[PDB]
Design a protein around this ligand. Structure first.
Ligand SMILES: OC[C@H]1O[C@@H](O[C@H]2[C@H](O[C@H]3[C@H](O[C@H]4[C@H](O[C@@H]5[C@@H](O)[C@H](O)[C@@H](CO)O[C@H]5O)O[C@H](CO)[C@@H](O)[C@@H]4O)O[C@H](CO)[C@@H](O)[C@@H]3O)O[C@H](CO)[C@@H](O)[C@@H]2O)[C@H](O)[C@@H](O)[C@@H]1O
Ligand SMILES: *[C@@H]1O[C@H](CO)[C@@H](O)[C@H](O)[C@H]1NC(C)=O
Ligand SMILES: *[C@@H]1O[C@H](CO)[C@@H](O)[C@H](O)[C@H]1NC(C)=O
Ligand SMILES: *[C@@H]1O[C@H](CO)[C@@H](O)[C@H](O)[C@H]1NC(C)=O
Ligand SMILES: *[C@@H]1O[C@H](CO)[C@@H](O)[C@H](O)[C@H]1NC(C)=O
Length: 494
C-alpha cells in the first residue's frame, strides 16, 4: 500500500504520535531489499553485502558479489523472527501473504546450510567459521584478500544469530522446522570444538583475525597452524564480545582462562562523561568511534536484562541524539560507505571513523556523512525517537528508493551513497523487531548458561559504571533538516 517516498508524507510529530504506523511503512519498503541479486543469492541462500543503485533511476545496477558472517547474522536474525511468526518480520518478508513468511525463511535457511556445509568440506581449515566470501557463484569461495584469514568478530555475530534461529524454529513445534533447526545445531556445535584452537592464543588473548597456514588442510592436520594476525585482539566491549561468550560457554576453556578473558578485556571497558554545550554531563561506555554499529552485541544477547547495563546504554542514546542537536547535524553517525561519484557510479570509499569523538577511543573522525542505520540503538529504547531520526535522514534527497532507505547522505546534502547494504538497512529492521536477545535468553536458560552471563556481565559493568550522570537528560529530536542543494530524487521513488 504505502508510497515509496512515504517518509515526507508524515510530519515528525506524526511519527511520535503513531510510531507503529510509520514502522509498518518502513518494514514494507525495507523488505523490497530482500530479493535475489539485490541482497542475496537465492541459488545458494547466501547474502550479498548489497548493491549499487543507479544515480538517476534508483534501480539495482551492480551488486557487491562478496559478503561476510556479519551480514549473515543480520539475515539469520530476521529469519528467526520470520519463522517464529512475527507479523512485523512477515511485513518485511512476505507482506502480501504473511502466513508464507515462515516457509520462506525455512527454505532459504535450508539452502544456506547446504552452502555452509559445501564450503566447510572444500575449506576445512576454517573449522566451520566463515571468512569474507564471494557468494555470486553456487559454491562459496574466500575473497582473494581473505584466503587463509578468518575474523572472530563477524563469526561471533553469526553464531548467536543461528542460536536464536534454532530456538525460534523449535518454538513453532513444526516438525520440518525442528529438523532444519537440528541440522543448524550440528553446524553451530561443530564451531564449539574448533573455536579455542583457531582463535584463543592464551592469557585472555583472542585473535581479531586468525591466519591459517592452509585453508585446504583440516583443523588438526599435522601441518595446519593458526596464529593471530599481528597484535589485534578481541579485547573490547563492542561487537567482538559476542565471540568472547562463545569461547567461555562452548570453547572448553579452564576457569583460569575464562577469568583471563575478562581480565584482559577490563582496561577497554571505560566510563567517560559526554559534555558539550548545555548537553550533559552524560556518563557513557567509552566507544571506539562511538559509531552506532559498536552496540551490535545488544541485538544478539540479553545485555538489557541487566539494569546497570540497560541504564549505561540508555545514556548512550541520550548522548547520541543530543550530540547531533547541539552540533546541528540532521542525522547521527556510524561506520558507512561514502558517497557515490555520479560520473562513475562508484562509491568513493568506506568511512570507518564516524561517531562522537569526545567519548571515543579514536578521536580523529570524519563527520561529513550520516546514515539512517545510526538510529538502530536508539530504536531499542524508543521506537518513536529512533524513527523520527530515521525519517529526518530519509527525507534527504535520494534517501529513499524502491528497496527502502539509501545507504548514506552528506549532512550538507551535496552527495549520497547510491547503495544498499544489510549493515545500513537491516540493522535497523532487526532493532525494530526487538533484537533476538529474547530467543537467545530462552535457549541460554534452557542450557543453563543464562545465570553465568548475568553474574559475569553485571559484575564487569557494575565494577566500572558507578555514579552515572545525566540519566535525567531526555532523548533529543532532530532540529535540522538535510539541506536540498539540487540533488534530485530517484525517478522510481519521488
Ligand atoms: O558491509 C558494510 C561495508 O563493510 C566494509 O568493511 C569495513 C568494515 O566494516 C565491518 C565492521 O566489522 C569489521 C571489523 O572492524 C572492527 C569494528 O567493527 C569494531 O567496532 C572495532 C572496535 O572493536 O574494531 C574493528 O577492527 O574488523 C574485521 C576485519 O579485521 C571485519 O571482519 C569486520 O567485518 O563492522 C560490522 C561488524 O559489526 C561489519 O558488518 C562491517 O562490514 O570495517 C572495517 C574497520 O572499520 C573497514 O576497514 C572495512 O572497510 C566493506 O569494505 C564494504 O564493502 C561494505 O559495504
Ligand atoms: C566440517 O568438516 C570436518 C572435517 O572435514 C568434519 O569433521 C565436520 O563434521 C564438518 N562440519 C560439519 C558441521 O559438518
Ligand atoms: C595448500 O594445501 C593444498 C591441499 O593439499 C595444496 O594443494 C596447496 O599446494 C597448499 N598450498 C600451499 C601454499 O602450501
Ligand atoms: C569521502 O568523500 C569525500 C568527497 O566527497 C572525501 O573528501 C573524503 O575524504 C572521503 N572519505 C573516505 C573515507 O573515502
Ligand atoms: C584507546 O584504547 C587503548 C587500549 O585500551 C588505550 O591503551 C589507549 O590509551 C586509548 N586511547 C584513548 C585516546 O582513549
Amino acid at each position: 500500500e504505502p508510497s515509496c517516498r512515504f517518509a515526507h508524507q508524515y510530519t515528525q510529530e506524526q511519527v511520535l504520535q503513531n510510531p507503529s504506523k510509520f514502522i509498518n511503512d518502513v518494514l514494507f519498503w525495507e523488505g523490497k531489499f530482500h530479493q535475489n541479486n539485490i541482497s542475496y543469492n537465492s541459488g545458494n541462500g547466501m547474502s550479498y553485502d548489497g548493491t549499487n543503485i543507479d544515480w538517476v533511476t534508483g534501480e539495482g545496477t551492480v551488486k557487491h558479489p562478496f559478503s561476510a558472517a556479519s551480514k549473515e547474522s543480520l539475515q539469520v536474525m530476521l529469519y528467526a523472527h520470520a519463522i517464529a511468526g512475527s507479523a512485523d518480520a512477515a511485513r518485511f518478508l512476505s507482506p502480501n501473504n504473511p502466513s508464507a513468511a515462515p516457509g520462506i525463511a525455512a527454505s532459504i535457511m535450508d539452502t544456506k546450510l547446504q552452502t555452509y556445509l559445501r564450503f566447510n568440506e572444500t575449506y576445512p581449515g576454517f573449522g566451520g567459521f566463515l571468512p569474507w566470501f564471494t557468494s555470486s557463484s553456487q559454491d562459496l569461495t574466500p575473497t582473494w584478500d581473505w584466503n587463509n584469514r578468518v575474523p572472530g568478530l563477524d563469526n561471533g555475530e553469526l553464531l548467536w544469530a543461528v542460536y536464536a534461529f534454532i530456538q525460534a524454529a523449535e518454538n513453532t513445534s513444526n516438525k520440518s522446522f525442528i529438523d532444519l533447526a537440528k541440522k543448524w545445531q550440528t553446524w553451530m556445535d561443530y564451531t564449539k570444538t574448533t573455536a579455542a584452537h583457531i582463535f584463543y592464543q592464551g592469557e585472555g588473548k583472542v585473535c581479531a583475525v586468525t591466519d591459517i597456514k592452509n585453508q585446504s588442510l583440516p583443523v588438526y592436520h599435522p601441518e595446519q597452524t593458526y596464529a593471530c594476525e599481528g597484535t589485534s585482539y578481541l579485547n573490547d566491549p563492542y561487537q567482538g564480545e559476542l565471540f568472547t561468550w562463545w569461547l567461555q560457554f562452548f570453547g572448553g576453556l579452564s576457569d583460569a582462562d575464562i577469568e583471563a578473558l575478562w581480565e584482559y578485556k577490563r582496561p577497554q571497558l571505560v566510563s567517560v562523561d559526554y559534555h558539550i554545550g548545555n548537553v550533559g554531563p552524560i556518563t557513557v561506555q567509552k566507544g571506539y568511534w562511538f559509531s552506532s554499529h559498536e552496540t551490535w552485541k545488544v541485538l544478539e544477547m540479553p545485555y538489557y536484562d541487566i539494569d546497570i547495563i540497560r541504564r549505561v546504554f540508555q545514556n548512550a542514546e541520550r548522548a547520541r541524539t543530543c550530540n547531533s542537536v547541539v552540533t546541528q547535524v540532521p542525522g547521527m553517525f556510524a561506520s558507512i560507505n561514502n558517497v557515490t561519484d555520479p560520473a562513475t557510479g562508484d562509491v568513493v570509499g568506506y568511512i570507518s571513523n564516524a561517531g562522537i569523538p569526545s567519548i571515543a577511543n579514536q578521536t580523529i573522525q570524519e563527520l561529513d556523512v550520516i546514515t539512517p542505520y545510526s538510529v538502530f540503538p536508539t530504536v531499542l529504547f524508543d521506537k518513536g525517537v529512533g524513527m523520527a531520526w530515521w525519517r529526518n535522514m530519509a527525507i534527504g534527497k535520494k534517501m529513499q528508493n524502491i528497496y527502502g532507505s539509501t545507504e548514506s547522505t552528506r549532512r550538507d546534502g551535496t552527495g549520497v551513497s547510491a547503495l544498499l547494504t544489510w549493515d545500513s538497512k537491516v540493522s535497523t529492521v532487526n532493532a525494530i523487531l526487538g533484537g533476538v536477545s529474547g530467543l537467545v535468553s530462552q535457549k541460554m536458560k534452557a542450557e543453563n548458561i543464562y545465570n553465568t552471563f548475568v553474574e559475569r556481565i553485571e559484575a564487569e559493568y557494575s565494577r566500572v559504571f558507578k555514579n552515572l550522570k545525566g540519566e535525567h537528560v531526555p532523548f533529543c529530536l532532530p532540529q535540522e533538516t538535510v539541506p536540498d542543494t539540487g540533488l534530485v530524487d530517484f525517478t522510481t521513488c519521488n
